[PDB]
Amino acid sequence: PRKMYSCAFETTTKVEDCRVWAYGYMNIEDHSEYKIGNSLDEFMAWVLKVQADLYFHNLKFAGAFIINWLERNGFKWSADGLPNTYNTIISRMGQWYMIDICLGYKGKRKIHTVIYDSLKKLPFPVKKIAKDFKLTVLKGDIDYHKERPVGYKITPEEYAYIKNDIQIIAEALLIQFKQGLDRMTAGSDSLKGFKDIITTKKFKKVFPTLSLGLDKEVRYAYRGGFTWLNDRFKEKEIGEGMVFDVNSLYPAQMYSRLLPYGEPIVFEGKYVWDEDYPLHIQHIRCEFELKEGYIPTIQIKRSRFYKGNEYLKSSGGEIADLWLSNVDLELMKEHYDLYNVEYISGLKFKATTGLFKDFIDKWTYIKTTSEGAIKQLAKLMLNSLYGKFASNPDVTGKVPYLKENGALGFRLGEEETKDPVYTPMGVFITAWARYTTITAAQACYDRIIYCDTDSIHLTGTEIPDVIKDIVDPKKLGYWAHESTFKRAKYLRQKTYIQDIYMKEVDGKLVEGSPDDYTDIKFSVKCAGMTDKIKKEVTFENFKVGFSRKMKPKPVQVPGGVVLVDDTFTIK
């Protein structure tokens, strides 16, 4: 059986002297088996013999120093795994998934040691994982800026830290491996747990593979969450308001919305109602104009000039070519006026509402009757299933090379195709989720400020009558009143600040209200901004242009990678 280890490195900050100054590995199935050294060569020697699976939390970082060594020691990339060859899996976007170091073959069996990224299985920081999973974690951290000459001697303190960091990840991964959750990513673990429940046989019949051409057309109807900032509040400091968040958005749509499955049926012109093929995607061409008092919902695919992440008020003179789910089209007709419409073609699908009920009940039950690690993993199982259905078949990522400086460099590999799971399911799940948010926001049009996938922000502190009946703190798919603020300022999508009313309960601060609060918690949300940077933001300086050179970024130098403080600007 191949073994499994939790690994970690401790690198130097010098842009010139970049090298591993400490390492450590621990057997996931036997934590008594562990070693902490201070030589990459010593480590790599081990890596070559173990013939096992290794896991680093944030392979992107450690996976660098590993490539540098493999290259300066008889290895080079090779998709078909050859002796002293090493293949990889990296995406055009720069996400590391696996490094498969091959040494040779014995019979027809492949002698190798694969290196995986634990961050892909547990999408959180070690600190956070420890906290939420309730695993012993030492406070403080190894002095990062301290001269460490080659062959440096690791102190007992650093040793303890290094052991703790890898023991946490080991304890976490073991809980998943103990349940068959032995996949590379969270999504895949979720898909696996899903197949276990309905059986692979049924899965195959229900979710047929589609022809790349058909899948390309369905993909045209896919969209993400609904993130929109009302212009009426753009860059203005406002008063009291409140925030509502849906209780498990996606899992909720999966639990009770009419979703597609099976083989699609192509049709010409405008879809005709068919009880056995309830859902459909329509290829339509038209012009549109936003109806008075309605939120925009139509977004034209990025780069097909009109604009990227913005919702159109009108086609502005030019014809729109769209592929919409029946949910999206229904919503569009309620909010817009359509003109010069031409129904081209489309696809029909059979649909049911009972496809994920058992999967959700199971894991939710577990989530309800568990705590610590078990609880968090059940949440992960439930929260990672929807994404898997929507996967860009074009798995064409970067291919490793050695830059003339002795630094790691990459270049585009070529088109590789990973046949689809079932895209139609991704289209409708996201569509239903958008419908949930948009209709709720539209119902509160006079008070609506901002929307972001599963939450709506409104002015005022009283729960709107139109949504009173679907507001609850825990029920699935219902809206929960998350917080109330005394003042806020929204600059753009996913970019805002608030002063949240907080009250003390059982010795800890929790969201309060105007009639019951003891403190005001300043909160900053901005894509890209780091913890440290947020501490310098205030109501009188939070605006477009804000800048600080406090956002470190991976700058690959000879040996591995180093973090150099770059500039961060609110644009």
Coordinates of C-alpha atoms in Angstrom, one line a residue:
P1 CA 0.0 0.0 0.0
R2 CA 1.6 3.3 -0.7
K3 CA 2.5 5.3 2.5
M4 CA 1.5 8.9 3.1
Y5 CA 3.5 11.7 4.7
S6 CA 2.9 15.2 5.8
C7 CA 5.8 17.5 4.9
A8 CA 7.1 21.0 5.3
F9 CA 10.1 23.2 4.5
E10 CA 11.5 26.3 6.2
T11 CA 13.1 28.7 3.7
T12 CA 15.4 31.7 3.7
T13 CA 14.2 35.2 2.9
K14 CA 17.4 36.4 1.2
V15 CA 16.8 37.0 -2.5
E16 CA 20.3 35.8 -3.2
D17 CA 20.7 33.0 -0.6
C18 CA 17.5 31.0 -1.3
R19 CA 17.6 27.5 0.2
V20 CA 15.8 25.2 2.6
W21 CA 17.2 25.6 6.1
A22 CA 14.9 23.1 7.8
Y23 CA 12.7 20.2 6.7
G24 CA 10.3 17.7 8.3
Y25 CA 8.1 14.7 7.4
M26 CA 5.6 12.6 9.3
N27 CA 3.9 9.4 8.5
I28 CA 0.1 10.2 8.3
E29 CA -0.8 6.7 9.6
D30 CA 1.9 6.6 12.2
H31 CA 2.9 10.0 13.7
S32 CA 5.6 8.3 15.8
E33 CA 7.5 8.0 12.5
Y34 CA 8.8 11.5 11.8
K35 CA 12.1 13.3 11.1
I36 CA 13.2 16.9 11.2
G37 CA 16.4 17.7 9.3
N38 CA 18.2 20.7 7.9
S39 CA 19.4 19.6 4.4
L40 CA 17.4 19.4 1.2
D41 CA 19.8 16.9 -0.2
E42 CA 19.2 14.7 2.9
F43 CA 15.4 15.1 2.3
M44 CA 15.5 14.5 -1.4
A45 CA 17.6 11.3 -0.9
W46 CA 14.7 10.1 1.3
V47 CA 12.1 11.2 -1.2
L48 CA 13.7 9.0 -3.9
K49 CA 13.6 5.8 -1.8
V50 CA 10.2 6.0 0.1
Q51 CA 8.1 5.3 -3.0
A52 CA 5.2 7.0 -1.3
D53 CA 2.8 10.0 -1.4
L54 CA 3.9 13.3 0.2
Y55 CA 1.8 16.3 1.1
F56 CA 3.0 19.9 1.5
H57 CA 0.6 22.5 2.7
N58 CA 0.9 25.0 -0.2
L59 CA 2.8 22.9 -2.7
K60 CA 3.2 26.0 -4.9
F61 CA 5.8 27.2 -2.5
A62 CA 7.7 24.1 -1.5
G63 CA 7.2 22.5 -4.9
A64 CA 9.5 25.2 -6.2
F65 CA 12.6 24.2 -4.2
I66 CA 11.9 20.6 -5.2
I67 CA 11.9 21.3 -8.9
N68 CA 15.2 23.2 -8.6
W69 CA 16.8 20.1 -7.0
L70 CA 15.3 17.6 -9.4
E71 CA 16.7 19.7 -12.3
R72 CA 20.2 20.0 -10.8
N73 CA 20.3 16.2 -10.1
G74 CA 19.5 14.2 -13.2
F75 CA 15.9 15.0 -13.7
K76 CA 13.7 16.8 -16.3
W77 CA 10.0 17.0 -17.2
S78 CA 8.4 14.2 -19.3
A79 CA 4.7 13.6 -19.5
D80 CA 5.2 9.9 -20.1
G81 CA 7.1 9.1 -16.9
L82 CA 10.6 7.8 -17.7
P83 CA 13.5 6.8 -15.5
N84 CA 14.9 9.9 -13.8
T85 CA 11.9 11.7 -15.3
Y86 CA 9.4 13.9 -13.4
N87 CA 5.9 14.9 -14.6
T88 CA 3.6 17.5 -13.1
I89 CA 0.1 18.9 -13.0
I90 CA 0.0 22.7 -13.0
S91 CA -2.8 24.9 -14.4
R92 CA -2.4 27.9 -16.7
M93 CA -3.4 29.9 -13.6
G94 CA -0.4 28.6 -11.6
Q95 CA -2.0 26.2 -9.2
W96 CA 0.1 23.2 -8.2
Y97 CA -1.6 19.8 -7.9
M98 CA 1.0 17.1 -8.2
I99 CA 4.7 16.3 -8.9
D100 CA 5.3 12.7 -10.0
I101 CA 9.0 11.8 -9.6
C102 CA 9.9 8.7 -11.6
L103 CA 13.1 6.7 -11.0
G104 CA 12.4 3.7 -13.3
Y105 CA 10.3 0.5 -13.6
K106 CA 10.3 -2.9 -12.1
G107 CA 8.2 -5.3 -14.2
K108 CA 5.4 -3.2 -15.4
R109 CA 5.2 -1.4 -12.1
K110 CA 6.2 2.3 -11.8
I111 CA 8.7 3.1 -9.1
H112 CA 7.9 6.7 -8.1
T113 CA 7.1 9.1 -5.3
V114 CA 4.3 11.6 -5.9
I115 CA 4.1 14.9 -4.2
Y116 CA 0.7 16.4 -3.6
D117 CA -0.7 19.7 -2.2
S118 CA -2.6 19.4 1.0
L119 CA -4.1 22.9 0.5
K120 CA -6.1 21.4 -2.3
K121 CA -7.7 18.9 0.1
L122 CA -8.0 21.3 3.1
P123 CA -8.5 24.9 1.7
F124 CA -7.5 26.7 4.9
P125 CA -4.3 28.0 6.7
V126 CA -2.7 25.6 9.2
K127 CA -3.6 28.0 12.0
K128 CA -7.2 28.0 10.9
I129 CA -7.3 24.2 10.3
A130 CA -6.0 23.7 13.8
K131 CA -8.6 26.1 15.3
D132 CA -11.7 24.8 13.5
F133 CA -10.6 21.1 13.8
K134 CA -9.6 21.6 17.5
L135 CA -6.0 20.3 17.1
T136 CA -3.3 21.4 19.4
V137 CA -1.4 24.3 17.9
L138 CA 1.4 26.3 19.5
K139 CA 1.1 30.1 19.7
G140 CA 3.7 32.4 18.3
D141 CA 6.0 31.6 15.3
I142 CA 9.6 30.9 14.3
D143 CA 11.6 34.1 14.0
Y144 CA 11.5 34.4 10.2
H145 CA 14.1 37.2 9.9
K146 CA 17.2 35.7 11.6
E147 CA 20.5 35.0 9.8
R148 CA 20.9 31.2 9.3
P149 CA 24.2 30.2 7.7
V150 CA 24.4 26.9 5.8
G151 CA 24.2 23.9 8.1
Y152 CA 22.5 26.1 10.7
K153 CA 21.5 24.2 13.9
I154 CA 17.8 24.1 14.6
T155 CA 16.8 25.1 18.1
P156 CA 14.4 23.1 20.2
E157 CA 11.8 25.8 19.7
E158 CA 12.0 25.7 15.9
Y159 CA 12.0 21.9 16.1
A160 CA 8.7 22.0 18.1
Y161 CA 7.2 24.4 15.6
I162 CA 8.2 22.4 12.6
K163 CA 6.8 19.2 14.2
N164 CA 3.5 20.9 15.2
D165 CA 2.9 22.3 11.7
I166 CA 3.1 18.9 10.1
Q167 CA 1.3 17.0 12.8
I168 CA -1.7 19.3 12.4
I169 CA -1.9 18.5 8.7
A170 CA -1.4 14.9 9.4
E171 CA -4.2 14.6 12.0
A172 CA -6.5 16.4 9.5
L173 CA -5.7 14.3 6.4
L174 CA -5.9 11.1 8.4
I175 CA -9.6 11.8 9.3
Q176 CA -10.4 12.0 5.5
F177 CA -8.2 9.1 4.4
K178 CA -10.0 7.1 7.1
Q179 CA -13.3 7.6 5.2
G180 CA -12.2 6.8 1.7
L181 CA -11.7 10.5 1.0
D182 CA -8.4 9.7 -0.8
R183 CA -8.8 12.0 -3.7
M184 CA -6.5 14.9 -4.8
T185 CA -9.0 17.7 -4.2
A186 CA -12.0 18.6 -2.0
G187 CA -14.3 18.7 -5.0
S188 CA -13.2 15.2 -6.0
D189 CA -13.7 13.9 -2.4
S190 CA -17.2 15.3 -2.6
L191 CA -17.9 13.7 -5.9
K192 CA -16.6 10.4 -4.5
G193 CA -18.8 10.6 -1.4
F194 CA -21.7 11.3 -3.8
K195 CA -21.0 8.3 -6.0
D196 CA -20.8 6.1 -2.9
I197 CA -24.4 7.0 -2.1
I198 CA -26.0 6.7 -5.5
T199 CA -23.6 4.1 -6.9
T200 CA -21.2 4.6 -9.9
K201 CA -23.6 2.6 -12.1
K202 CA -26.5 5.0 -11.6
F203 CA -24.2 8.0 -11.8
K204 CA -23.0 7.0 -15.3
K205 CA -26.6 6.5 -16.5
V206 CA -27.9 9.7 -15.0
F207 CA -24.9 12.0 -15.8
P208 CA -23.9 10.9 -19.4
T209 CA -20.7 12.2 -20.9
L210 CA -21.5 14.8 -23.6
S211 CA -19.8 15.5 -26.9
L212 CA -17.3 18.4 -26.7
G213 CA -19.5 20.3 -29.2
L214 CA -22.6 19.9 -27.1
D215 CA -20.7 20.7 -23.9
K216 CA -19.3 23.8 -25.5
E217 CA -22.9 25.1 -26.1
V218 CA -24.1 24.3 -22.6
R219 CA -21.0 26.0 -21.2
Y220 CA -22.3 29.2 -22.9
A221 CA -25.1 29.3 -20.3
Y222 CA -22.8 29.0 -17.3
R223 CA -22.3 32.0 -15.0
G224 CA -21.1 32.6 -11.5
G225 CA -22.6 34.2 -8.4
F226 CA -24.4 37.5 -8.6
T227 CA -22.2 40.3 -7.3
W228 CA -23.6 43.8 -7.8
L229 CA -23.2 47.2 -6.1
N230 CA -26.1 49.6 -6.5
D231 CA -24.8 52.8 -8.3
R232 CA -27.0 54.8 -5.9
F233 CA -24.5 54.0 -3.1
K234 CA -21.2 53.8 -5.1
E235 CA -18.4 55.4 -3.0
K236 CA -20.8 57.0 -0.5
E237 CA -20.5 56.8 3.3
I238 CA -23.9 55.7 4.5
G239 CA -25.7 55.2 7.8
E240 CA -27.4 52.2 9.5
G241 CA -27.9 49.0 7.5
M242 CA -28.1 45.2 7.7
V243 CA -26.8 42.1 6.0
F244 CA -28.6 38.9 5.2
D245 CA -26.9 35.6 4.2
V246 CA -28.6 32.4 2.8
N247 CA -28.0 29.3 4.9
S248 CA -26.0 27.1 2.6
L249 CA -26.9 28.6 -0.8
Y250 CA -25.7 25.9 -3.2
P251 CA -26.6 22.8 -1.1
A252 CA -30.0 24.4 -0.7
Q253 CA -30.6 24.6 -4.5
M254 CA -29.3 21.1 -4.8
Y255 CA -31.7 19.9 -2.2
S256 CA -34.9 21.1 -3.7
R257 CA -34.7 22.8 -7.1
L258 CA -35.7 21.1 -10.4
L259 CA -32.4 20.0 -11.9
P260 CA -31.3 18.3 -15.1
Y261 CA -29.9 14.9 -15.8
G262 CA -29.7 12.5 -18.8
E263 CA -29.2 13.0 -22.5
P264 CA -30.1 16.4 -23.9
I265 CA -32.5 16.7 -26.8
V266 CA -31.7 19.4 -29.4
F267 CA -34.5 21.5 -30.8
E268 CA -35.0 24.4 -33.3
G269 CA -36.5 27.8 -32.7
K270 CA -38.3 28.5 -29.4
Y271 CA -38.6 25.7 -26.9
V272 CA -42.0 24.1 -26.7
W273 CA -43.3 23.0 -23.2
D274 CA -42.5 19.3 -22.6
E275 CA -43.5 17.8 -19.3
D276 CA -40.8 15.1 -19.7
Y277 CA -38.1 17.6 -20.6
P278 CA -39.0 20.5 -18.1
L279 CA -35.7 22.4 -18.2
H280 CA -33.9 23.8 -21.2
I281 CA -31.2 26.2 -22.5
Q282 CA -32.3 28.6 -25.2
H283 CA -30.0 30.2 -27.8
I284 CA -31.6 33.6 -28.3
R285 CA -30.6 36.8 -30.1
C286 CA -32.1 40.1 -29.2
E287 CA -31.9 43.6 -27.9
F288 CA -33.0 44.5 -24.4
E289 CA -33.8 47.5 -22.1
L290 CA -33.9 47.4 -18.3
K291 CA -37.4 47.9 -16.9
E292 CA -37.9 50.8 -14.6
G293 CA -37.2 49.9 -11.0
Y294 CA -35.4 46.6 -11.7
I295 CA -31.9 45.3 -10.9
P296 CA -29.8 44.4 -14.0
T297 CA -29.1 40.7 -14.4
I298 CA -27.7 40.2 -17.9
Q299 CA -24.0 39.9 -18.1
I300 CA -22.3 39.5 -21.5
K301 CA -19.3 37.1 -21.4
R302 CA -16.0 38.7 -20.5
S303 CA -13.8 40.0 -23.3
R304 CA -16.7 40.0 -25.9
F305 CA -16.8 43.7 -25.7
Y306 CA -19.5 45.2 -23.8
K307 CA -17.6 44.7 -20.6
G308 CA -16.6 41.9 -18.1
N309 CA -18.1 41.8 -14.6
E310 CA -20.9 44.4 -15.1
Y311 CA -24.6 44.0 -15.5
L312 CA -26.1 45.6 -18.6
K313 CA -29.0 48.1 -18.5
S314 CA -29.4 47.7 -22.3
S315 CA -27.8 46.1 -25.3
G316 CA -27.0 49.7 -26.3
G317 CA -27.8 49.6 -30.0
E318 CA -26.2 46.2 -30.7
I319 CA -27.6 42.7 -30.9
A320 CA -27.0 40.3 -28.0
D321 CA -26.2 36.6 -28.6
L322 CA -27.1 34.6 -25.5
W323 CA -27.5 31.0 -24.3
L324 CA -29.8 31.1 -21.2
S325 CA -31.2 28.5 -18.8
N326 CA -35.0 28.7 -18.5
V327 CA -34.4 30.1 -15.0
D328 CA -32.2 32.9 -16.3
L329 CA -34.5 33.7 -19.2
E330 CA -37.6 33.8 -17.0
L331 CA -35.7 36.3 -14.7
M332 CA -34.6 38.3 -17.7
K333 CA -38.1 38.8 -19.1
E334 CA -39.4 39.9 -15.7
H335 CA -36.6 42.5 -15.4
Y336 CA -36.1 43.5 -19.0
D337 CA -38.1 44.4 -22.1
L338 CA -37.0 42.3 -25.1
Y339 CA -37.0 43.6 -28.7
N340 CA -36.2 42.1 -32.1
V341 CA -36.1 38.6 -30.5
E342 CA -35.0 35.6 -32.5
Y343 CA -35.2 32.1 -30.9
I344 CA -32.4 30.1 -32.7
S345 CA -32.1 26.6 -31.0
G346 CA -31.5 24.9 -27.7
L347 CA -31.4 21.8 -25.5
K348 CA -34.1 20.1 -23.4
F349 CA -33.4 18.0 -20.3
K350 CA -35.2 15.6 -18.1
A351 CA -35.3 16.9 -14.5
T352 CA -35.8 15.7 -11.0
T353 CA -35.7 17.2 -7.5
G354 CA -34.4 14.1 -5.6
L355 CA -30.9 13.7 -7.0
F356 CA -28.9 15.1 -4.0
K357 CA -31.4 14.7 -1.1
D358 CA -29.8 11.6 0.4
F359 CA -26.2 12.9 0.0
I360 CA -27.2 16.1 1.7
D361 CA -29.2 14.5 4.5
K362 CA -26.4 12.1 5.3
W363 CA -23.6 14.7 5.6
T364 CA -25.9 17.3 7.2
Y365 CA -26.9 14.8 9.9
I366 CA -23.2 14.2 10.5
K367 CA -22.6 17.9 10.5
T368 CA -25.4 18.4 13.1
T369 CA -24.2 15.6 15.5
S370 CA -20.5 16.3 15.3
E371 CA -17.9 18.8 16.4
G372 CA -14.3 19.8 15.7
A373 CA -12.7 18.2 12.8
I374 CA -15.5 15.8 11.9
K375 CA -17.9 18.7 11.7
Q376 CA -15.7 20.9 9.5
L377 CA -15.1 18.1 7.1
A378 CA -18.8 17.4 6.7
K379 CA -19.2 21.0 5.8
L380 CA -16.4 20.7 3.3
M381 CA -18.2 17.6 1.8
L382 CA -21.4 19.5 1.4
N383 CA -19.8 22.8 0.2
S384 CA -17.5 21.3 -2.4
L385 CA -19.9 19.1 -4.5
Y386 CA -21.5 21.8 -6.7
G387 CA -18.2 23.1 -8.2
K388 CA -17.2 19.7 -9.5
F389 CA -20.0 19.6 -12.1
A390 CA -18.6 22.7 -13.8
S391 CA -15.1 22.0 -15.0
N392 CA -13.2 23.6 -17.9
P393 CA -12.5 20.5 -19.9
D394 CA -9.4 22.3 -21.3
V395 CA -6.8 21.2 -18.7
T396 CA -3.9 23.0 -20.4
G397 CA -1.4 24.2 -17.9
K398 CA 2.2 25.3 -17.5
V399 CA 5.2 23.1 -18.3
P400 CA 8.4 23.5 -16.0
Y401 CA 11.8 24.8 -17.3
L402 CA 15.0 26.1 -15.9
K403 CA 15.6 29.8 -16.4
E404 CA 19.1 30.9 -17.3
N405 CA 19.4 32.4 -13.8
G406 CA 19.0 29.1 -12.1
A407 CA 15.5 30.2 -11.2
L408 CA 12.3 28.3 -11.9
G409 CA 10.4 29.4 -15.0
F410 CA 7.3 28.2 -16.9
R411 CA 5.8 28.2 -20.4
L412 CA 2.5 27.1 -21.8
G413 CA 2.2 23.4 -22.4
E414 CA -0.3 22.4 -25.1
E415 CA -4.0 21.6 -25.3
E416 CA -5.1 18.6 -23.1
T417 CA -8.7 17.6 -22.9
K418 CA -10.4 16.2 -19.8
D419 CA -13.9 15.1 -20.8
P420 CA -16.8 16.7 -18.8
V421 CA -18.7 15.4 -15.8
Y422 CA -22.1 17.0 -16.5
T423 CA -22.1 20.7 -17.3
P424 CA -25.9 21.2 -17.4
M425 CA -26.0 20.6 -13.7
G426 CA -23.5 23.4 -13.1
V427 CA -25.6 25.8 -15.2
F428 CA -28.8 25.2 -13.3
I429 CA -27.3 25.1 -9.8
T430 CA -25.7 28.5 -10.3
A431 CA -28.8 29.7 -12.1
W432 CA -31.1 28.8 -9.3
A433 CA -28.7 30.3 -6.7
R434 CA -28.7 33.6 -8.7
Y435 CA -32.5 33.5 -8.9
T436 CA -32.7 33.1 -5.1
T437 CA -30.5 36.1 -4.4
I438 CA -31.8 38.4 -7.2
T439 CA -35.5 37.9 -6.4
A440 CA -34.9 38.5 -2.7
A441 CA -32.9 41.7 -3.6
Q442 CA -35.5 42.9 -6.1
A443 CA -38.2 42.4 -3.5
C444 CA -36.3 44.9 -1.3
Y445 CA -35.4 47.2 -4.2
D446 CA -36.0 50.5 -2.3
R447 CA -33.5 49.5 0.4
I448 CA -31.0 47.3 -1.6
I449 CA -27.4 48.3 -1.5
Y450 CA -25.2 45.4 -2.5
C451 CA -25.5 41.7 -3.4
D452 CA -22.8 39.1 -3.4
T453 CA -23.7 35.6 -4.4
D454 CA -25.5 34.5 -1.2
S455 CA -26.0 37.8 0.6
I456 CA -27.8 41.1 0.4
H457 CA -27.0 44.3 2.1
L458 CA -29.9 46.8 2.9
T459 CA -30.2 50.2 4.4
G460 CA -32.2 50.3 7.6
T461 CA -32.3 47.9 10.6
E462 CA -35.8 46.5 10.4
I463 CA -36.4 43.2 8.6
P464 CA -38.3 43.9 5.4
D465 CA -41.9 42.6 5.4
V466 CA -41.6 41.1 2.0
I467 CA -38.9 38.7 3.2
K468 CA -40.0 38.2 6.8
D469 CA -41.4 34.8 6.1
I470 CA -38.2 33.4 4.6
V471 CA -35.8 34.7 7.3
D472 CA -34.4 32.2 9.8
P473 CA -31.1 31.6 11.5
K474 CA -30.5 28.0 10.6
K475 CA -33.0 26.5 8.2
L476 CA -31.6 25.4 4.8
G477 CA -32.1 27.9 2.0
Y478 CA -33.7 30.5 4.3
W479 CA -32.1 33.9 4.8
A480 CA -30.3 34.5 8.1
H481 CA -29.9 38.0 9.6
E482 CA -26.2 38.0 9.8
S483 CA -25.3 41.5 11.1
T484 CA -26.4 45.1 11.6
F485 CA -24.1 48.1 11.0
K486 CA -24.1 51.7 12.2
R487 CA -22.3 53.0 9.1
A488 CA -20.6 51.7 6.0
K489 CA -19.0 52.6 2.7
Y490 CA -19.0 50.6 -0.5
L491 CA -16.4 51.4 -3.2
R492 CA -17.0 48.5 -5.6
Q493 CA -17.8 44.9 -5.8
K494 CA -16.3 42.9 -2.9
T495 CA -14.8 46.2 -1.7
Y496 CA -16.4 47.8 1.4
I497 CA -16.2 48.7 5.1
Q498 CA -18.7 48.6 8.0
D499 CA -18.9 49.4 11.7
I500 CA -20.8 46.3 13.0
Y501 CA -22.9 46.4 16.2
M502 CA -21.3 43.8 18.6
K503 CA -22.5 42.5 22.0
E504 CA -20.8 40.4 24.7
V505 CA -22.2 36.9 25.4
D506 CA -20.5 34.1 27.4
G507 CA -17.3 36.1 27.4
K508 CA -17.1 36.6 23.6
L509 CA -18.2 39.3 21.2
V510 CA -21.0 38.4 18.8
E511 CA -23.1 40.3 16.2
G512 CA -25.4 42.6 18.1
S513 CA -28.1 45.1 17.2
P514 CA -28.9 48.9 17.8
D515 CA -31.0 48.1 20.9
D516 CA -28.5 45.6 22.2
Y517 CA -24.8 46.1 21.7
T518 CA -21.7 47.0 23.7
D519 CA -19.1 47.5 21.0
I520 CA -18.6 48.6 17.4
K521 CA -16.5 46.2 15.3
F522 CA -14.8 47.8 12.3
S523 CA -14.8 45.4 9.3
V524 CA -12.9 45.7 6.0
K525 CA -13.6 43.6 2.9
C526 CA -11.5 44.0 -0.2
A527 CA -10.3 41.4 -2.7
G528 CA -6.6 41.1 -2.4
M529 CA -6.0 43.1 0.7
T530 CA -4.1 41.3 3.4
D531 CA -4.7 41.3 7.2
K532 CA -1.8 43.6 7.9
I533 CA -2.9 46.1 5.3
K534 CA -6.5 46.2 6.6
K535 CA -5.2 47.4 9.9
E536 CA -4.3 50.7 8.3
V537 CA -7.7 51.4 6.7
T538 CA -10.2 53.8 8.3
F539 CA -13.4 55.6 7.2
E540 CA -11.4 58.7 6.2
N541 CA -8.9 57.0 3.9
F542 CA -10.8 54.1 2.4
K543 CA -11.2 55.1 -1.2
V544 CA -10.0 54.2 -4.7
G545 CA -6.3 54.9 -4.8
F546 CA -5.5 53.6 -1.3
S547 CA -2.0 52.1 -1.6
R548 CA 0.6 50.4 0.6
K549 CA 3.6 48.2 -0.3
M550 CA 2.7 45.5 2.2
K551 CA 1.5 42.7 0.0
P552 CA 4.2 40.1 -0.5
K553 CA 4.3 38.1 -3.7
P554 CA 6.2 35.0 -4.9
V555 CA 9.3 36.1 -6.8
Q556 CA 11.1 33.0 -8.0
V557 CA 14.9 33.3 -7.6
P558 CA 17.7 30.8 -8.0
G559 CA 16.9 27.9 -5.7
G560 CA 13.2 28.3 -5.0
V561 CA 11.0 31.3 -4.2
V562 CA 11.1 34.4 -2.0
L563 CA 8.4 36.9 -0.8
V564 CA 9.1 40.5 -1.7
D565 CA 6.7 43.2 -0.4
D566 CA 4.9 44.6 -3.5
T567 CA 2.4 47.5 -3.8
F568 CA -1.3 47.0 -3.3
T569 CA -3.8 49.6 -4.7
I570 CA -7.5 49.8 -4.5
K571 CA -8.7 50.2 -8.1

